[PDB]
Design a binder for this molecule. Structure first.
Ligand SMILES: OC[C@H]1O[C@H](F)[C@H](O)[C@@H](O)[C@@H]1O
Ligand SMILES: [Ca+2]
Length: 769
């Protein structure tokens, strides 16, 4: 490997061999079908709300999130980079597709597939990823850096449906070598959203943009229809000319054929026919190819940028609503703008690289932090793009001031902005994209007094319940299968209108968003204040026994939605205490004296009774009335965790908090698989995992990262990082279960999982507060 010295990969990048088989991989541990796309994954490309494309460590474009809210795992084999090399003096050169695999059927059989093992590496530190190619049959070594401009405090470039592929080629040998790099792409119009005639009318054109000291050559792959539908738009691939490279292209090759129309040209001398052809297709799939060719002398290095863009302006959800995607603000809505997007990337990628380096640098340069922690911190952010992210710029047919936003909990539980989960998972938004965060919270504020008296069947017990109760915060803002932002509470496994955590978590999120953006945004507190008061007042009515604390009802009436709580729970009780203290403080900021006094009174009574009911001398009991009420819960002091972040001080005695955290580390971490897999949710005081429910026997990745954050604030530094390390290890390490770029909600002691691609582990960013 002589190419790594010519590029700048951070030591904390996650790494794997191209074509590496992984032997330890986990699978779903549930009864019903659950997504398992395998361990062949990579860091995604594409902006927030743009739709994303997962290019895996084997080189294939395989995890398709272009249909917003859906996960489709299938390798589009025509989408590749390929290389040609010929040493001066030899009769023939060699050509190779840079993909460690081959097609299942006979399409593209002429191409040279099966990139060999032990001949290259993949690296990822989101939003960047890299491939190096160090192959004994390729004398010139190559590397690519690929990325999308995902940039904190930037709501523009961060939305773009674009990827840059910055190639570096170096000749370590003593002979001249002719080199070509080719990007191929299928015209994917009709890949989704078209019920019949899926290729019909697709056509490709070549754009040559020649301006002094600029040449870009690009293929635009679109459809003859000017219809404005979810399926219609354009894809573009292209390259910017640099000194010493020549550009060639082929506008149209057949993807549903043997591929020799293209490959016979590329494999001969690395130079394509430059054949334009705008003839639309009928049944056949078609694609385009953009190539560069250059000669590298001994010791010479050259850099060349390619790019990919996709202009699919309309997202459609299953309930029938069509919305424009955020990036349309910047490029237009007509779906004929893929070249403009591509051109912007090709002309500005160096600036974008520097902007990404500027934001990563504070963390990467901190030599007190171990590299594994940096690997997790950056790569967990993949989910902000890959979580079915929806970000609207108007309803089709509709002009408002704000752009509504939603992140899925996951794809198996297809619910936007699940608030009980976002309590953990929204840290990167408040810390890095706070205008999005506040918009999402205003969305929730607006739902507080919505009433929908129509009834739904509760999944857990078959009983009927009201969809949405006035003054109760919703579980979610809908489903991609129905009507995001419009029809809330798509979730039906339990009735969220009786949950005891949602209203408190809402208030805690509001105050968090004020505190972590500098305690300056009084207008945000003013906007949300009525909803905060309503939320707490409604929750107070669920106190059955007049101890000043809402009573859990012997059912799963909170985020642990199969784990029953009864009476006063440590979890919901501590959240309530903290929410009361937050509301007191907002009351002071907004000069609402009567609110301050009321929530102060409620807080004092609740705090006294919480401590009396639950403090056992070593930790806080799980709750007051359940069968295993003395279980040690990993999340028992979630309210105190948030109180630390919100700078609300002690809600419980410092000494008791420290004892409880040490107990959790000693039991839930260290007695669960020797502390190498995170914190199990429930442990009995005899040191055996609590078996009352599956959720008690699970490690929750986002809960564990949050607990690590809590330990860190409380000065338990070793315990914090050891606790978090288990999650990193399981996710990323060779000794783990292969969950990179699909971190699940949960695993059991065998390492098998529930709900890959989950929002909650974004909570790792609470470790950076
Ligand atoms: O894993 C538990 C988790 O499962 C689903 F995502 C639910 O919608 C969430 O409310 C719940 O917290
Ligand atoms: Ca009570």
């Amino acid at each position: 490997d002589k190419i790594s010295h010519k590029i700048d990969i951070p030591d904390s990048a996650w790494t794997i061999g191209i074509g590496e088989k992984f032997k330890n991989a986990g699978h779903p541990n549930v009864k019903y079908p659950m997504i398992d796309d395998s361990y062949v994954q990579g860091a995604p490309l594409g902006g927030f709300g743009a739709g994303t494309i997962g290019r895996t460590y084997n080189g294939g474009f395989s995890r398709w999130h272009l249909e917003i809210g859906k996960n489709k795992y299938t390798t589009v084999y025509a989408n590749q980079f390929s290389v040609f090399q010929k040493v001066e003096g030899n009769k023939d050169g060699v050509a190779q597709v840079l993909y460690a695999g081959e097609p299942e059927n006979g399409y593209l059989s002429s191409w040279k597939w099966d990139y060999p093992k032990e001949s290259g590496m993949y690296y990822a530190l989101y939003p960047n990823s890299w491939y190096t190619y160090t192959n004994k049959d390729l004398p010139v070594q190559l590397a690519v850096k690929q990325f999308s401009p995902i940039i904190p405090y930037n709501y523009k470039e961060t939305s773009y449906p674009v990827a840059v592929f910055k190639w570096t080629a170096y000749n370590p040998t003593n002979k001249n070598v002719d080199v070509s790099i080719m990007f191929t792409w299928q015209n994917m119009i009709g890949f989704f959203g078209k019920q019949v005639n899926v290729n019909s009318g697709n056509f490709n054109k070549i754009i040559k943009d020649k301006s002094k000291d600029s040449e870009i050559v690009a293929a635009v792959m679109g459809n003859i229809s000017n219809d404005n539908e979810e399926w219609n738009g354009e894809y573009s691939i292209g390259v910017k000319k640099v000194p010493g490279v020549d550009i060639s292209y082929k506008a149209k090759f057949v993807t549903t054929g043997d591929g020799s129309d293209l490959w016979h040209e590329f494999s001969k001398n690395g130079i394509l026919d430059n054949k334009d052809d705008e003839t639309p297709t009928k049944q056949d799939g078609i694609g385009s190819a953009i190539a560069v060719n250059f000669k590298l002398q001994p010791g010479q290095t050259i850099e060349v940028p390619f790019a990919l863009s996709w202009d699919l302006p309309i997202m459609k959800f299953g309930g029938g609503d069509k919305w424009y995607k955020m990036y349309t603000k910047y490029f237009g809505k007509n779906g004929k703008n893929s070249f403009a997007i591509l051109k912007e990337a090709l002309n500005n990628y160096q600036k974008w690289e520097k902007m990404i380096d500027d934001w990563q640098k504070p963390i990467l340069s901190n030599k007190s932090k171990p590299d594994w922690y940096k690997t997790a911190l950056f790569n967990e952010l993949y989910y902000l793009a890959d979580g079915g992210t929806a970000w609207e710029n108007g309803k089709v047919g509709e002009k408002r001031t704000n752009n509504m936003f939603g992140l899925l909990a996951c794809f198996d539980y297809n619910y936007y902005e699940t608030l009980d989960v976002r309590f953990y998972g929204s840290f990167p938004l408040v810390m890095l994209w706070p205008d999005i965060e506040k918009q999402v919270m205003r969305q929730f504020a607006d739902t507080i007094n919505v009433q929908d008296s129509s009834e739904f069947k509760v999944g857990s017990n078959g009983a009927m319940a009201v969809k949405k109760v006035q003054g109760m915060i919703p579980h979610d803002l809908g489903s991609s299968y129905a009507l995001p932002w419009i029809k809330i509470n798509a979730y039906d496994w339990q009735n969220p209108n009786i949950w005891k955590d949602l209203n408190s978590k809402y208030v805690l999120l509001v105050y968090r968003d004020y505190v972590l953006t500098g305690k300056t945004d009084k207008e945000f507190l003013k906007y949300t204040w009525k909803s905060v008061k309503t939320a707490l007042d409604k929750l107070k009515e669920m106190d059955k026994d007049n101890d000043g604390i809402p009573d859990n009802e012997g059912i799963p009436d909170q985020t642990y939605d199969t784990w029953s709580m009864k009476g006063t729970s440590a979890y919901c009780g501590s959240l309530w205490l903290a929410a009361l203290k937050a509301a007191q403080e907002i009351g002071k900021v907004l000069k609402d004296n009567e609110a301050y006094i009321k929530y102060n009174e409620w807080y004092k009574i609740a705090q006294q009774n919480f401590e009396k009911e639950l403090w056992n001398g070593e930790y806080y009991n799980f709750d007051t009335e359940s069968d295993h009420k003395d279980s040690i819960m990993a999340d028992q002091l979630a309210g105190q965790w948030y109180a630390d972040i919100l700078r609300l001080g002690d809600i419980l005695p410092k000494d008791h908090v420290q004892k409880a955290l040490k107990k959790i580390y000693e039991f839930n971490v260290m007695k669960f698989e020797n502390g190498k897999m995170g914190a199990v949710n429930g442990m009995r005081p005899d040191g055996i995992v609590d078996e009352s429910d599956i959720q008690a026997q699970e490690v929750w990745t986002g809960v564990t990262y949050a607990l690590a954050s809590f330990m860190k604030y409380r000065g338990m530094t070793e315990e914090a990082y050891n606790t978090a390390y288990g999650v990193y290890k399981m996710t990323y390490d060779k000794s783990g279960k292969g969950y990179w770029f699909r971190t699940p909600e949960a695993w059991t002691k065998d390492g098998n999982y529930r709900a890959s691609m989950y929002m909650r582990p974004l909570s790792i960013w609470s470790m950076e507060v």
